[PDB]
Structures are given as structure tokens and as C-alpha cells.
Write a protein that binds this ligand. Structure first.
Ligand SMILES: O=[Se]([O-])O
Ligand SMILES: O=[Se]([O-])O
Ligand SMILES: O=[Se]([O-])O
Lengths: 461, 461, 461
């Protein structure tokens, strides 16, 4: 009696789970919104801005109309390598952006100390990938983490928040190229006998110079001990797999839950109803980057409802113009919605006037949501890269480009108002008194912004 | 000198052979029509109505426009498992429908007794797949089997017929969920020392309670002995394969013969000229279910010509409206043509009036074919699932849904006439005197049929 | 710590490199044009006209609209086998045409003798593939080879030229089915103790009857010795691969260089922006076969500039009508451009009048290029096969058909002028005095050409 080779693992539910972390795939929580949960862990923030800063040169005519295809190829080649290191060292990649990836090792509190050592080693091996031949910066933090899931009956989004999350962004902003920086609390909780550090000026964070373990220390044996605490580390018959999620079996109730996190045009490709290459493109879009700030940004029970309320309104306003929320994440300050007009074959006429009117509408509504202290919105239009970024087993649809960065910097450098770039201003052809011309500011990671404007709106008052 | 790994087995001819049984793939018979052949074997009829009865709930809004994709995923997940069991135990899957799969173990007559034991064990292992967590019913029969191949210069269709075929449907209709039922002759021919059964009331068929072989019996050794008689059981260098058909090599003459059994839109996907996901859909169609009854339905030499004559006319009438024959099979009584208006991008305007006129035309022609005793046609319109159902190595295009079942029950409960449902009647907007409103009947596996009508046609006489 | 299986090698750059030989993939030469380089090697010319001569019967209605799909399937099945033999014996397939494949073993001069023995054995094993059940003819040559790369900022093309190249075509034209023929110089340079030959009448070339090595000779050990001299023979960890090119990693600068050799519609499929089956078709096209002859066709420094000049003009004239250069190769005499109007969804109205006007324009320009002695152009229109021909790891887009052969024979049998077939003449509906009706010639591999015409052009003078 033959025993033929088990082959099939390429179900839609498996393809969907590539787009999500284990935190969500295996999370099994209520469909009520907002949903909040609390845990501890170590976070890793890998800044890949050195990689993503190549978008503008792939618009060069030297790439002969295959810019987007070449871009996605070289980006995924490098990012895949980082992703494998993360996954092999037992982390869960939570999210990708066009500057970073964020990864989590969730553990009970007593194991934080040893897990930090694992993440440090991982960090150093990631830096090792790029030593000779584009580099990265890594910030690490550890401690209490809150997860928030918000959405409606058809879409879901999640975020991690709290001091370990603020910490890992602060850690990462301090870092030079090739640094691994630990947050003060990560430093306080870590195994000091393992690692040699140095002070960072006016900073209680630290930099890791070396991992030098003791005489009898054996990282492989130490790692194996650590895997006792890693719920989903592939093992046994599945020890050849990067993720346990690759083994997911069809389950309609689970798939209904998971699909809500993924954009419809991505699901269409997953269902083999669209060419697998149609979403990689350099296309003109309008970014509407919305930032919400709160009295206290680490208090999920406080900020959860407010974000949910904002989300409900944002989605209804975007729906009108097939605008899309590409991503939500906590910025150094506040909760940010990266909204896009124009991307997977969703490209309206008058994109610009409507983008501005939608931004104003969002601004006016969110301003009156209880507990939202300040709303700020940056609007920028130009050619951006759109595509599925990451590894075959773990990847997300992402938008990368100078205009994306500019919209992000605008909403931070010009808080409390709706701003737009010159392409949006000039292109809207709205009467000029709908705007206020703004003072120029020197903005981190931005050169040659042209003139910036505030969208004042239709009335003087 | 390198010896690189032989990889290529994904030729079009291999993809085509997934759609067909070994009976046809390796059959090498004349292209003359009708063609009849005669043999002996054991049949297995696995009723999967418990699985296919989920179509209506995948039309729920809870599935967010991915009903058809989720449906096909969960259905193939379960059906694949059954298919593997069949294939490993050495059977040939002849056909899939939206209630059943039919499988054949063809052997010389002297081996029927031992092969029945193999099929019984297979049956019990199939029931074991679904014990804890939708179940199936299995009917088995054994004896003489006739094959009929009919068609024209561009299309072919086959059927198995005879008392073993009537037997296996009768066996299967007696079964409760989880039963394995043997036909009287299967019982007469089987190895009674192996199996413990019980009587079934007013039935010479039997139910299998247990397979309890003797002390020294070793199923693996018994199976190996049995494989001596299985012509195409994968073995040797190919013992890792589910089907020998996976090894087929390009052969234009063979491929010309095999392609005639497969629908053109399926061939288009096979040729990588259509997205691999375009044929899975919930779409509105009109089912025209045609049933032909004969004086004696086990006499191939008698019924072959008549079916061929009917086929020639049916195909010419369907051609006019890109109606399609989805399948042909022997129903409990008679030969049935499952015809579909609307499915792989073949969707006409006035689908309904034409479906009715085509049904009448078929009815009038077939009524005058010598040896056709009674023609009955059910016509029903609504949303049905359409898709490729089964395993990667063995699968067929199938239509599943309440309207498909309703058309089937209509043609059986209202013999001798053309009937239609309310959607067809009301939608045709034909004058009401073209119809006769029918008495309501309680029909097996049908609740809440609305009013049913007879299509009387254009004239009183 | 898991060590999961390295999987990914299906990058765009790898798919592109399937279309090119190692000579180009690993060539790393300047982007200046023309570029010339010089080396020594053994050439193998495998005539597959017996395979490609089946195109006309796949247009038969017996193939039911899947002619092109069946054709490409059976052709690639056989050609793949030849390609594997070539690659395993260490050759580089330079180019495919609809009559031949040309393969190169490039080595330092001192190794030519032993490499010829390797190629002879390869040749004999290729003949062995087809012994019992369409055959091939093989010509071999050895000696000095020049490579020419020409093109512009967005397209590149290469050619090998010189006496070893003229030799291998002459060798191949002498061959009967199943022969291996060596050029005089190949014979002069080869290891005579290994091989038994016979004279060929009025020919200093020879035919190989047998490879009979000495008593102690061990081909496997001899081959291993030979691999010392083969730069890219897969080995070590990659000894399971047919080509080292399968291991290429993303590299934007390399990919920009390589893509210029490949047609845009092929790149579109590579980028998963077009169905993988869309380019296999039987479609009507106009072939414009341009032949350029030179005082001395082995002098790259002489013919390089002239070809580059011709290329610049040809491409600008074709651009106007999305005509395409399918291939360039040295014909028995001269450099030939196989140009096509109509193929990957590039099909203009008035294809015919424009094809003739473009041919005349090319003829007039090339006639005045210094060092071009004679220009000849054949124009033929009809249904031709278009498709990707070869092995998964090494394949090219190719056009095959009686009209392709006819255009080729016209330009050789009617030198110095522009000729066209009857479909082109009649179809152009140009006034008849734009043409001259030509004497019929009996042309190698052509029966039933209808009347042929010269395109005289618009004026008497
Ligand atoms: O707020 Se994000 O770290 O998911
Ligand atoms: O009549 Se069917 O069992 O193919
Ligand atoms: O001139 Se061709 O042998 O590439």
C-alpha cells in the first residue's frame, strides 16, 4: 500500500496568513471592537530606510519601464533575508512599513531576561548580513505591551502600544547605521554579564558593542532552552518550516476573521483572480497621512475607544472615494493612519480636490472625539512604489516613496492642521484663498520640499 | 558528469488527465460512437451530500463576496482526503457530482471476492476520516459493468451502466450516515469470513458492522497480493505517486482524444490562457436536467444507440445558446444529462425563455427516439456553485446547489413532461397559458420549492 | 535553532537568464556598440527541421483550436531532451531557431582536441534519443570564434561569426538524417585514435561512423578531467542543477543589461503581468527576412560597424510599425535579421503595404552602408507558430513555419532585391506596376511556392 508524499499546503487560508503575524493568526479573540489585550515581550525595530530610499532612482529612465519590478525584486531579496533571521530566532514579524519592520518575541515576564539575549544575537546576525555590501539600524525594547484591534464588520486593523513600543521607536531614532540600541528598561531587564555596552549622550538608552558570553556558554543549548517558552516555534515534524502558519488548514470561520485584515485586491490575487504581478507598480497617488495624539498614548483603555471612533468615520469618508487605509501604526507621537487615494486600480478623477475635502472632513470629525487631543494631517501627491514586500512566508502590501515620507513629516512638523504639498495645491486648482502658504521648516529626512500649504477650507471662519 | 533531478511532469496532457479516470486515460478504444465495452468490478458510491449541502450558507453576506472561494477551499480539503484514500487503496475515481463520487476497481471475475475486502476496508477508512468532525454514506456493489462512450467529432462523454451500477445507487439510497451498505450480489460474492453484517429491513442488501479478519490475516500482505491484479497501481520508481497518469508524456494523438471529454473553458485554464481561479464562482444559471428512461436500462447494446441519438440532438440544440452538458450519469432510473445555461462566461440574455424552448425541443425529439420510453425534464434557475472539485491529481468541473437538486427531483417526481420552477416561470414573462400550474409534491431532499409548473408549450394541441 | 530548506530561486533575473546563454549571462562586457570579442571553441549545430516541419499539420482542424498548444508541448518535450544532453555534457546553448539550435563549448586552444571528443559523444547520445521514435542532423566545427554584440540603449543582440561558424553550417548542410559531420578543421584538430570516420564526396569534411576509444579509456574520468576547463559547469553544492544561471541573485545593474536582449512581451510574462500561455499561438504575420552580405564575413572588425549601422536603421524603421526583430544569425552567407510584423499582440492594420515599404526603406539604407556588398530581403505572409521553445532552464521566443522558411529561401535565391510572396502581393492591393513578376526557382525545402514578385517600388526609376 503506497504512502505518497504529503504535498498540499497552498490553500487560500495559508496565503492569507502570510500577511499577518502569529499574534493575529493564532490570536482567537472576540470580534468586538475595540478589543484590547495585554502582555509582555521584547520588541525589535529594524530601520530599513537605507533600502527603501532607492525608490526615487528606480523611477529613472535607466530602468526602462521595469522600475517597480526591479525595485520589488531587490528589496525583497534583502528584506527576505532579515525576515528569515527573525523567524529562525523565534520572533513574530508584526508589521512592515516603508522605513521599518517591527518584530515581537512575546513571553512571560520571567523569561524577558534570556529572550533579550536571543534578540541581541539575532540583531547582530542581521547586521552581519549587510556588513560588506544599504545598512540597517536596530532598536530594542522590552516590557509591557498592549494590543488593540479595531474595525468594523468587514475590516480589522491592529496596533501595539505602550512604553515598550514608544521605547523601541526612541531606541531606533538614536541609532546610527549598524547600531543596536537598547531602551533604558531593556537595559535594566537584560543579562548584563552577556553584553558589553556604552553610554549614549543625554540618554539612559544604551548601545551594544559586543555580545561576549561566559566561558561555558553555548548559544545553541541556550536557544533550545528558550524555545520552551515559544508557543509557535516550528518543531518536530515541522522543524523544516519557517512558520507554523504554513501548516494552517482550511477553516471557514478562521478565514473569515483573517481576511478582514487584508485588502480586497490582495485577496483577489490570493484567489487566483488577478495576475500575481499586477500590484507591483510605480503609480501616482495622493497620500493622506492622519495623526492622532492623546493625553496619554500608553493607556489602551483610554485610547482604544477613541481610535475605534476615528476609524469608523475615516473608513466611511474614504469609502466614498475608494481611498484606502494602507496601515496604522503608532508614530513617535500618536496613532497614524496611512491613507491612500489611487493604488490597486482604485484611481478616481479629481483625486486632489477630494483628497483635501476628505482630509478636512476627517480633521473636523476627529477633532471632536473625546480624548483625541490633536489631529494633524499631511497630504502629498506623486509617484510612489506600491507592492507586496517581505518574504514568501511573511509579507505585506506596502507603499514606499519620498511623498509618503513627506506626508509623514508634514503631519509631525505642522501639528494641529491639514497641510499639503505643491503638487496637491497647484493640481487642485481650488481658489487660492482656500489655502495658507506656510513657513518653510527643515524636516528630518526631507530635502527640497517645495512650498507647503495649509488647507484652510472653504470659509474664512 | 552531473545527473540532475528529473522535474517536469506538468504538461498539458497531464493536466487534462486529472479530469479523467484511468478507464478513459488508458482505455485506447475506437473513436466510433456509441462505443460499448464490458467488464467486471467493484463499485463504491460515496454520498457527499452532507458536504455539498453547505452551498446555500456560503451565499450569506457573512462570507463577504468570497463565498465561492471559501466553499471550494473547504470542499476540496475534505474531498481530497477521500480521493487519496480511494487512490491508495487502488480505485479509479470515475466521476464526481454535487452529491457523490463514484469509484471503480476493475478486475477479472475471479478476484472480485478479495477486491471487495479491499474496498470494504477503504470504505471504513473513509468513514474514519470524518468520525469526530458532515459525514458520508457509502454503497458498494460488484458484478458485471458496461461502459458506454458517446459523442461527436469534438466531444466525448462516458457512462457506466448495468446491474452493479443500479445496485450501487440502491445500496447508497438505503444507507444512513456512516453506513457501508453492500448490494445483494456484492454480499453473495464477498468473503463472509472477513466481515460481520446485519440485515436491512425489506432488503436483500446488507450493512457492514465490522471487518474482523482471521487470526493470521495481515491486510498489508493481502493488499500486496491484490495489487498483482491492479494494472495501474503506482509502483517501483513511481510508488511515490497517487496516479500513474501523473507520468503521462506528450502524445498528440492521445491528447486529441482526451481533450474531447473536457470543457473548453477548462482547457483554456490548462493552457495558461485564463486565471486559475476564474472558474470558481457562485453564479446564476438555468439548469436543464434531462432524464431518459428505457425498457431495459442495463442493456448497453440497446440503450447505446438511443443515447447517442439523443446526444447528437441535445448538443445541437444547446450549441445554439452556449448551453453546456456538465455531466451525464445513470440516475436510479434512466440516463440523465445535466445541462447548464450561463456558467464559464457563457451567459446569454433571455436565458429563461430559451432554456424552456430548448427543453421543449429536446423533449420532442427524444420522445421519438426508438427505445426511449419516457423523457422528463426539470428546469430550475438560481445561484449555483460552479468549480473544479476534487484533488490536484483527480478533479472535475462540477455544479452544486439547491437549484441543481430541485431540477433533478422535478424530472423524477414529474415524469413524462417538462417542468420548471417559479424563478423560470415568472422570469420568462411568457404568457401564462404556455404553462400548467402543478400539484405540490413532497420531494426527497427538497423543502420550500415554491410553485412548480409544467411547460405546456405554445399551442393547446 | 531550525535550519529551514533554502527555496527561492525564481527571481525575475533568473527567468530572464533562461533566455540567454552563459556567454552573455556571465559575459560582463562593455555597453559600447558594436562590441567584439574573440575566442576558441567547439560548435554544435543540431538541425531540428524534422521537428519544426510539423507546424503545418497542427493548423489542421483535427487539433480543434489547440494546435499551437499541442505544438509547443510536443516540440518542447523533444527539444528539452536535447537541451539537457547539451547542458550535462557542459555546452552553452547559444541560440534557437525554427530549424536549429546552436551550442558552444568555449575553451582555451590546447583543450580543443579533448573537448571535441566530449562533443562527439554528446552528439551520439542526442542521436540515441530519437533512434526508434523525426530525427536530427548534427554538424560540428572547431576553431576561432568571434562574438559581436550590437544594439542601442534599450536593446541588444549578439552573433557569433568566423570560419568555425561558417564551417558548422557547411557541416550541417552536408549531413543526412542521423549523421554527425565534422568540419575539415574539426577533423584536423580532433583525436583521431578515438573515432572512426568516412570520407564525404567532394568534401574535406568527414562523417563520424563510430566513437571507439582505447582499452583503458574511461569516459567518466575523461569528462571529469575536461570539466577543469569548463568555467560554469554546475558543481559542489550545485551539482544537481542544469545551469549555474539558476542560482543568479538579484542585481539591478546585471538585470538592466540582460533584459535588453529579451522582447518586452516576454518580460511582461516574466513579471507576472501576462498569462504564462498568451505567447503560444498560431497567428498570421508578415516575415521580413533581411540578409546582408560582406566582402569578408569572418572579419568582425570589418563587419561589426556595418551591422551596427544597419541595426540602428532597421530598428527605427520597425519601431514605426511595432515590427520586431525576432532573431539575428549568420546564414550560410551573410548576416540575417528575422523581422516580424504582427506577433505578441503587436498587430497593425495594412500590415502588408507597410511591410513592403519598410522592406524597401531597409533595402535602400543598407545598400549604402560601407562594407555591405549586397542586401536581399524576402517578404512572406501567413500563419506561423509563435512561442517559447526549449527547456525550462534554457528557452527562447521563436517563430516557426513554412512562411518563415519561404522568406529565408527567397532572400537567398533572389539576391540583391526585395521579393514577396503571393499573399503579400495580392493582399497589398498596391498597383501591379509596383511589382515585377519573377521566374519560378526550385528552392531548397520549398514546394508549391505560388508566384513570387519583386517589389520594384513606386517609381520606374
Ligand atoms: O503600533 Se505598531 O507597533 O503595530
Ligand atoms: O452511469 Se455513471 O456511473 O458514470
Ligand atoms: O551567428 Se549565430 O551563430 O549566433
Amino acid at each position: 500500500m503506497n504512502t505518497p508524499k504529503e504535498e498540499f499546503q497552498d490553500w487560500p487560508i495559508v496565503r492569507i496568513a502570510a500577511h499577518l503575524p502569529d499574534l493575529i493568526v493564532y490570536g482567537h479573540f472576540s470580534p468586538e471592537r475595540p478589543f484590547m489585550d495585554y502582555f509582555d515581550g521584547v520588541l525589535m525595530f529594524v530601520d530599513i530606510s537605507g533600502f527603501t530610499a532607492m525608490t526615487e532612482k528606480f523611477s529613472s529612465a535607466m530602468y526602462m519601464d521595469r522600475g517597480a519590478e526591479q525595485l520589488v525584486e531587490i528589496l525583497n531579496y534583502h528584506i527576505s533575508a532579515i525576515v528569515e533571521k527573525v523567524l529562525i530566532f523565534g520572533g513574530d514579524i508584526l508589521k512592515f512599513a516603508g522605513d521599518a519592520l517591527l518584530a515581537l518575541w512575546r513571553v512571560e515576564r520571567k523569561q524577558l531576561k534570556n529572550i533579550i539575549t536571543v534578540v541581541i544575537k539575532c540583531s547582530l546576525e542581521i547586521h552581519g548580513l549587510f556588513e560588506t555590501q544599504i545598512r540597517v539600524k536596530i532598536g530594542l525594547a522590552a516590557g509591557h505591551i498592549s494590543m488593540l484591534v479595531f474595525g468594523d464588520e468587514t475590516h480589522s486593523h491592529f496596533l501595539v502600544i505602550g512604553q515598550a513600543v514608544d521605547d523601541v521607536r526612541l531606541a531606533q531614532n538614536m541609532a546610527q547605521m549598524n547600531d543596536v540600541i537598547l531602551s533604558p528598561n531593556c537595559w535594566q531587564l537584560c543579562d548584563r554579564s552577556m553584553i558589553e555596552i556604552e553610554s549614549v549622550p543625554d540618554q539612559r538608552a544604551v548601545k551594544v558593542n559586543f555580545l561576549k558570553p561566559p566561558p561555558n556558554f553555548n548559544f545553541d543549548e541556550f536557544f533550545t532552552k528558550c524555545t520552551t517558552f515559544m508557543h509557535y516555534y516550528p518543531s518536530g515534524e515541522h522543524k523544516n518550516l519557517l512558520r507554523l502558519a504554513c501548516t494552517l488548514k482550511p477553516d471557514p470561520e478562521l478565514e473569515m476573521s483573517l481576511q478582514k485584515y487584508v485588502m480586497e485586491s490582495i485577496l483577489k490575487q490570493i484567489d487566483n483572480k488577478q495576475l500575481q504581478g499586477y500590484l507591483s507598480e510605480l503609480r501616482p497617488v495622493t497620500i493622506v497621512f492622519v495623526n492622532l495624539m492623546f493625553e496619554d498614548q500608553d493607556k489602551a483603555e483610554e485610547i482604544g475607544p477613541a481610535i475605534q471612533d476615528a476609524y469608523m468615520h475615516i473608513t466611511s469618508v474614504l469609502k466614498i472615494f475608494q481611498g484606502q487605509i494602507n496601515k496604522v501604526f503608532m508614530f513617535d507621537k500618536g496613532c497614524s493612519f496611512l491613507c491612500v487615494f489611487g493604488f490597486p486600480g482604485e484611481k478616481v478623477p479629481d483625486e486632489l480636490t477630494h483628497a483635501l475635502e476628505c482630509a478636512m472632513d476627517i480633521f473636523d470629525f476627529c477633532s471632536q472625539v473625546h480624548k483625541i487631543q490633536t489631529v494633524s494631517i499631511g497630504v502629498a501627491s506623486g509617484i510612489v512604489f506600491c507592492g507586496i514586500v517581505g518574504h514568501t512566508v511573511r509579507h505585506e502590501y506596502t507603499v514606499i516613496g519620498q511623498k509618503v515620507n513627506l506626508a509623514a513629516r508634514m503631519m509631525m512638523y505642522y501639528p494641529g492642521i491639514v497641510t499639503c504639498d505643491s503638487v496637491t495645491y497647484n493640481g487642485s486648482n481650488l481658489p487660492a484663498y482656500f489655502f495658507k502658504e506656510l513657513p518653510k521648516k527643515v524636516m528630518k529626512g526631507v530635502a527640497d520640499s517645495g512650498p507647503l500649504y495649509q488647507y484652510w477650507g472653504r470659509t474664512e471662519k
